[PDB]
Design a protein around this ligand. Structure first.
Ligand SMILES: [Mg+2]
Ligand SMILES: [Mg+2]
Ligand SMILES: [Mg+2]
Ligand SMILES: [Mg+2]
Ligand SMILES: [Mg+2]
Ligand SMILES: [Mg+2]
Lengths: 114, 155
RNA sequence: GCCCGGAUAGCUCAGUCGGUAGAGCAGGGGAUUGAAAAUCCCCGUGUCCUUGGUUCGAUUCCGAGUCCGGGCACCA
RNA sequence: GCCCGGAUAGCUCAGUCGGUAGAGCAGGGGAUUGAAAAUCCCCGUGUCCUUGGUUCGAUUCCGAGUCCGGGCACC
RNA sequence: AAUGUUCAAA
RNA sequence: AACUUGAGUGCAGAAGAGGAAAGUGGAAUUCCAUGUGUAGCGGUGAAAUGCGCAGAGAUAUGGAGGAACACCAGUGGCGAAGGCGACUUUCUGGUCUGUAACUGACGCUGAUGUGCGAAAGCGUGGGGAUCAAACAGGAUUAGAUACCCUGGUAGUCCACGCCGUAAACGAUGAGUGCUAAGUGUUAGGGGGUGCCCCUUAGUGCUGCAGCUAACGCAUUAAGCACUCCGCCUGGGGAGUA
């Protein structure tokens, strides 16, 4: 529980998830818009990101680590307002990563909406 | 007006009270063109403040507007192909003009059976809180300040 | 004829270990907008089941009490 | 020839365990709006199947009664 | 990214 | 009888997702395994059905299994057409350029037959990861069998065998000669100095002459000539009896 952390966030169009962990994948304190009472498509605002990175980041209480090293899953509208506002708990962002799973034409997508 | 910025040009001096912002609420209690019954009632509702409150109504009066002073507006705007609200902070010229209506609209609601005494219980009990009209400005003060939403909207 | 669980906003649940009452559905009034439904504010009354006692004080502990859910039920 | 279910706004159902009648579809009049359909208010009459009795009181319990649905039906 | 039907006779 | 320009055979080189048969790899989806963790994920205009403390989704490792091969990739290439795009090997068709050594008209078009022929469908097999008719559940409207969402069977996948249709589309049959010019691009071949102009073959645009009802086509003709085959003769009734 001692002073480390990698940041795994995703942001689809619904309920941008923030979950910070250690060098392994062990689940310090996950956080969502859904733990906060956002349901009517305020599940994903940049204001929903404004209370996303805060209530996971400030809920360290065992590590309070030195850097965060974000890994950006989920191409969606809550990206950079969850990484600027991650700094508001005082954690010293210094290098960012963007990992969204790009297929190589594996499985055919679901059909087009109308 | 699609053409822009009709000029303002309104003037408001006063006889004794030495205040531009007191001849405004004489211009809203005055209904039906009878200015000849406004300051007869208004100045007989301010000289009865010090007999009801602890102080002269001057140094209570800026406090009385100061606590009733509204902060935030919710002017609805169908953004970009959607439809829900947006908070707008009021430009400082408009906000007193929005502000003064809540004295008179609740002046005609307090059943004290004398209008120059029913109306003056919202300048007393206005520098001191939880008055009659402070309830609405705290009701709409948290309308979208707590309910913060898409705040990148234009209008 | 026997032991428990309790009657907790108009509906449903919560702590309710004597100084120490909460949520959500509903209702009303604004806003929306061609009109309703959604959707967003602002509000209130709870009942702590009848009643007495250990009571500085009982929604809270005993039992004079109504109702219903869990087991009764034996070789008459 | 036999045992039950009952005739509950004009249509369909509800409690109807003697003091103790409800919903929705329909109808009418406003509003809408170029005109109808939608859509929103505000309204009413029910029948508690014929009739007598235990009746402080029966839509409510008996049976003198009409109609139809459930079983009858045997060697 | 909508919830919107119809216009008796040439 | 001969000749060689039409078409063929030799020689050199040049490209190409042309096909059929094995083999290898990476990204991703899903479902199993276990860590950490706890109150929701997912969902739309808004919402619910569905999954969740019995331990979800987010994340760490690992396993299994099937489908398609991001970047290159482009009015790019190849095939008669449908079409074909990870990589290597085995077999194999076709066209282009230059060259002149042969053969000396051996060619063109094709009635009936003979074959190839997307996608769905059918038969006997296997395979089943994502999708996904019928259907089922939740909203939407007056009703919605629909558009929306959560699931889900056939099928979509491979071998063998049928069916033989489509906006199978440049809505433009096939062959051969001839009539202004610019302009990109691909595969070559010669001339002159990584660069500058000669012609052949495809393939895009802009444009006179000409035809055209007009839109527009215009050296890849819908122009000007010939040769052979297929087809139409007002629309409904009808690609039906
Ligand atoms: Mg102007
Ligand atoms: Mg099959
Ligand atoms: Mg579906
Ligand atoms: Mg085609
Ligand atoms: Mg063409
Ligand atoms: Mg004909």
């Amino acid at each position: 529980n001692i002073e480390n952390g990698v940041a795994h966030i995703r942001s689809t169009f619904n309920n941008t998830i923030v979950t910070i962990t250690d060098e392994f994948g062990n689940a310090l304190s996950w956080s969502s818009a859904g733990a906060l009472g956002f349901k009517g498509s305020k599940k994903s605002t940049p204001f929903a990101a404004q209370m996303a990175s805060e209530t996971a980041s400030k809920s360290a209480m065992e590590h309070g680590l030195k850097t965060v090293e974000v890994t950006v899953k989920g191409p969606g509208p809550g990206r950079e307002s969850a990484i600027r506002a991650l700094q508001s708990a005082g954690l010293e962002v210094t290098a960012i990563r963007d990992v969204t799973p790009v297929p190589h034409n594996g499985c055919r997508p679901p059909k087009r909406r109308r | 007006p699609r053409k822009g910025s009709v000029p303002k040009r309104d003037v408001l001096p006063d006889p004794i009270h030495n205040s531009k912002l007191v001849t405004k609420l004489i211009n809203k209690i005055m209904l039906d063109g009878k200015r000849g019954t406004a300051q007869r009632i208004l100045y007989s509702a301010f000289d009865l403040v010090e007999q009801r409150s602890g102080r002269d109504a001057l140094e209570v009066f800026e406090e009385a507007i100061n606590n009733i002073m509204p902060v935030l507006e919710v002017k609805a705007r169908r953004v970009g192909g959607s439809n829900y609200q947006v908070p707008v902070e009021v430009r400082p010229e408009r906000r007193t003009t929005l502000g003064l209506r809540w004295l008179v609209n609740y002046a005609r609601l307090r059943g004290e059976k004398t209008m120059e005494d029913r109306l003056a219980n919202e300048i007393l009990d206005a520098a001191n809180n939880t008055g009659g009209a402070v309830k609405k400005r705290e009701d709409t003060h948290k309308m979208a300040e707590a309910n913060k939403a898409f705040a990148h909207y234009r209008w």
